């Protein structure tokens, strides 16, 4: 039988995460920007949740990249902006959302390259 | 697009080199789905549930 819980969901105390990485961490909810070297748009559909970058330093022995941040490689994937916010909410991470950047629809026209009197007349194919 | 070509072809054909490069970096994409595969391993049913 149901009960009334007049409070927002918080599961921080159950996740076994140190206090350090719940209160001082800022997540970034966003759709990745298209990699500009390629034309495919298949990595621009889902929402991502990433954590603020923390220090990396050089290992004295080898020069490798050392880290003391356990969440540096954490990348959650979500279907909707709302699902990503809820997940950060119930986990206590302070979030920061960026709206989806879609490519604005453009007017194309092959026949415009040969305009009798407009500057869109190309000088070379 | 799944099993890499022969090394001799990798060093001769432009399709073979590309497929070698993608298979050994990104790997092949598997269509979305789930499967439960089991075999009679020497100890008994050895199963993989793969998503």
């Amino acid at each position: 039988q149901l009960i009334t819980v007049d409070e927002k969901l918080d599961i921080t105390t159950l996740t076994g995460v140190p206090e350090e990485h719940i209160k001082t961490r800022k997540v970034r909810i966003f759709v990745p920007a298209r990699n500009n070297m390629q034309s495919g748009v298949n990595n621009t559909k889902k929402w991502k949740m990433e954590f603020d970058t923390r220090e990396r330093w050089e290992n004295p022995l080898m020069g490798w990249a050392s880290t003391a941040d356990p969440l540096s490689n954490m990348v959650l994937t979500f279907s909707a902006k709302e699902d990503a916010i809820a997940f950060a909410e119930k986990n206590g991470w302070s979030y920061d959302v960026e709206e989806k950047k879609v490519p604005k629809p453009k007017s194309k026209s092959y026949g415009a390259n040969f305009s009798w009197n407009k500057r869109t007349r190309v000088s070379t194919k | 697009k799944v099993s890499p070509p022969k090394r001799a072809e990798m060093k001769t054909s432009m399709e073979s080199l590309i497929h070698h490069f993608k298979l050994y970096t990104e790997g092949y994409q598997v269509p979305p789905g789930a499967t439960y595969t089991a075999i009679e391993a020497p100890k008994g049913e050895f199963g993989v549930y793969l998503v």
């Binding site: 070297m37 990396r56 950047k101 415009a112 000088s123 070379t124 | -």
Partner: protein, 688 residues
């Protein structure tokens, strides 16, 4: 009410007339394979990779060019479409070189990736391949043209985005080669963008060459501060190191391009860096010390002087979280001499009304005007991506463009009204012949460059242009929601400084020289130890050792824009934020926490301990500095004009000559540009 209906595999789409088959498939979410087509270049139609079957037609149409006709069923995945793609991909690869392991594209190559998705897995080509000799077209773009697939994206980009009709195709048939025939350098403030739009490794970046692979790198979506356009960028890092800057798409700002300074000057972030606090020892030389030691000196001096005796100057690359922090500190010792190296006329309204010092029509408003009047500015170099948006309107919307100033080269044709700023008097009256155009303009746009307001008669020019626009607003009858008056800034921290009430220009310091000067990243060399009292305490906080550092008593190593989450406000007034890509080197610290650390040592602790609380404080001052990515409309220009008609200062007769005449002066302007070994090559490249 003219949206025809088309079908993509059966699903119906209502598209505008004139939409192509390729744009029709965008709407049902299907992306057509391509190489030659690019949404921001003129359609070419030669790669034939977009051939797509239309139901009931025998031949295959080029999806990227064929306009869509109502009642069509586009079969993006039929057998004809799949076979056309296999055949076409098979030809593209026949003469391509086995270069993927030595190619900087590999791992992010549209030719690699579209061959895996749409091509075949075999080669039946048993012949020899072609090999084309490479061209040397400058120190930024490496050409390995055997990899070219003759898609002509470079040719169209250069011609129509850079306005540099110097790339073309010579030869014919299978011997056809892209390039320049002669030996020319493709030097342009936008030339580095051919690296992005070239779909293969034919055009790659020399500075970046061989250094990393795409899968390795971590992408941090940040902003660019080399100028005031605030281009959205992506910073690739690998193992705590910055690899390359790439454009992030933002339709209303930089679209998909960045200037070469944005793209290639990051290597100045790795030289001449301040990594350790420094103080002067007994022989007068700077020596490394500790943070607790160094702050202890500045607090000790700050506790003495108050009021006019303490002043600060903000440089060209300072974040709003550090301007507001440095403002609060100095206001807590009575001082108000918070200044910026950039000059902005403080007569009339001054910075009272945002509309006075912003780009009120915005960057995307250029696309709607039908006349642009440029007053004292070389937009090609001050705002390279704003000149890109002008030429685009010059090309498509047939924008008329006029230039009051020097006859610089803008990459398009413009009417040169003259250089004497007496011409503003003429046009306002109605004498000048340009007014015949203005009477025919329903959307005028006057852009006054910040470079023209540095003149000794800066106030007069701004008042004149402010008045020539009050005649345009009634000589043409414009609506209240079309803004005509604009200011084009060239410094990243300028707009946010004025938002927070910094005094524009270092003129107050010349009036009342301070006994303590805070150089917060200032490097313009405006105030030198000959303008200041004998033995004056100077604290330099920055991230490069250039001009401010060697004259400092104390050096405080601050972060760079790649190394902090900071707020910058572009020329439109849009607020946007960077993000940490790497952390500051050595003992450098985030710039707003040094001033907060300093404030506690000196007993006047500031009321903020985290980035959150500092931005909340930014809100308390100017609440539009937390509205990220948002243009806040501003009115009350009429009021600023009414306060500008009373200024009794008059315009000198000096011709309006911008600081940058040629691409030579473009490459090295700020501290990071000057620490870059790639920009030094570019300077040496065009010079010799």
């Amino acid at each position: 009410s003219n949206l025809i209906e088309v079908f993509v595999d059966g699903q119906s789409v209502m598209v505008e007339p004139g939409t192509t088959v390729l744009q029709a498939c965008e709407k049902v979410g299907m992306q057509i394979p391509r190489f030659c087509y690019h949404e921001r270049l003129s359609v070419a139609g030669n790669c034939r990779m977009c051939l797509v079957e239309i139901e009931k037609a025998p031949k295959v149409v080029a999806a990227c060019a064929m306009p869509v006709m109502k009642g069509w069923n586009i079969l993006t995945n039929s057998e004809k479409s799949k076979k056309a793609r296999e055949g076409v991909m098979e030809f593209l690869l026949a003469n391509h070189p086995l270069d993927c392991p030595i190619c900087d594209q590999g791992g992010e190559c549209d030719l690699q990736d579209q061959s895996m998705m749409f091509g075949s897995d075999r080669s039946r080509f048993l012949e020899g391949k072609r090999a084309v000799e490479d061209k040397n077209i400058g120190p930024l773009v490496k050409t390995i043209m055997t990899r070219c697939i003759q898609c002509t994206r470079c040719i169209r980009f250069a011609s129509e985005i850079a306005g540099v009709d110097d790339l073309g195709t010579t030869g014919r048939g299978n011997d056809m080669q892209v390039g320049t025939y002669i030996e020319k350098m493709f030097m342009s403030e936008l030339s580095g963008n051919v690296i992005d739009i070239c779909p293969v490794g034919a055009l790659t970046s020399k500075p970046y060459a061989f250094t990393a692979r795409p899968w390795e790198t971590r992408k941090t979506e940040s902003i660019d501060v080399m100028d005031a356009v605030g281009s959205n960028i992506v910073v690739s890092t690998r193992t705590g190191e910055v690899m390359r800057i790439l454009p992030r798409m933002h339709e209303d700002i930089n679209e998909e391009w960045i200037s070469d300074k944005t793209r290639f000057a990051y290597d100045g972030l790795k030289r001449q860096r301040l990594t350790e606090p420094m103080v002067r020892n007994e022989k007068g030389l700077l020596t490394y010390t500790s943070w607790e030691d160094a702050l202890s000196r500045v607090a000790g001096m700050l506790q003495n002087f108050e009021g006019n005796a303490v002043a600060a100057i903000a440089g060209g690359l300072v974040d709003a979280e550090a301007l507001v922090a440095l403002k609060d500190l100095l206001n807590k010792v009575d001082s108000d001499n918070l200044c910026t190296e950039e000059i902005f006329p403080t007569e009339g309204a001054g910075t009272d009304l945002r509309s006075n010092y912003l780009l009120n029509t915005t960057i995307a408003g250029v696309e709607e005007a039908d006349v642009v009047l440029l007053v004292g500015t070389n937009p090609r170099f001050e705002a390279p991506l704003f000149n890109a948006r002008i030429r685009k309107s010059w090309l498509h919307n047939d924008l008329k463009v006029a230039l009051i100033g020097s006859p610089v080269d803008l990459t398009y044709r413009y009417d040169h009204l003259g250089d004497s700023p007496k011409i503003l008097q003429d046009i306002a009256s109605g004498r000048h012949s340009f007014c015949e155009v203005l009477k025919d303009a329903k959307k005028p746009m006057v852009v006054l460059g910040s470079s023209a307001l540095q003149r000794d008669d800066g106030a007069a020019i701004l008042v004149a242009v402010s008045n020539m626009v009050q005649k345009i607003r009634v000589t043409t009858g414009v609506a209240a929601e079309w803004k005509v008056m604009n200011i084009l800034h060239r410094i990243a921290s300028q707009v946010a400084a004025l938002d927070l009430g910094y005094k524009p220009g270092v003129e107050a310091i010349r009036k009342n020289p301070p006994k303590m000067l805070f150089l917060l990243g200032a490097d313009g060399g405006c105030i030198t130890r000959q303008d200041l009292p004998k033995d004056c305490f100077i604290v330099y906080q920055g991230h490069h050792g250039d001009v401010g550092a060697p004259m400092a008593d104390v050096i405080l190593p601050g972060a760079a824009y790649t190394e902090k989450s900071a707020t910058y406000v572009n020329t439109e007034g849009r607020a946007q934020q960077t993000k940490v890509a790497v952390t500051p080197p050595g003992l450098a610290r985030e710039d707003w926490k040094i001033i907060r650390a300093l404030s506690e040592i000196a007993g006047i602790t500031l009321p903020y301990d985290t980035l959150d609380q500092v931005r909340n404080r930014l809100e308390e001052v100017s609440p539009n500095l937390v509205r990220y990515d948002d243009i806040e409309e501003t009115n009350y220009f009429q009021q600023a004009s009414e306060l500008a008609k009373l200024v009794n200062q008059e315009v000198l007769a000096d011709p309006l000559v911008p600081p940058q005449l040629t691409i030579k002066d473009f490459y090295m302007t700020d501290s990071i540009s000057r620490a870059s070994q790639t920009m030094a090559k570019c300077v040496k490249a065009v010079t010799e």
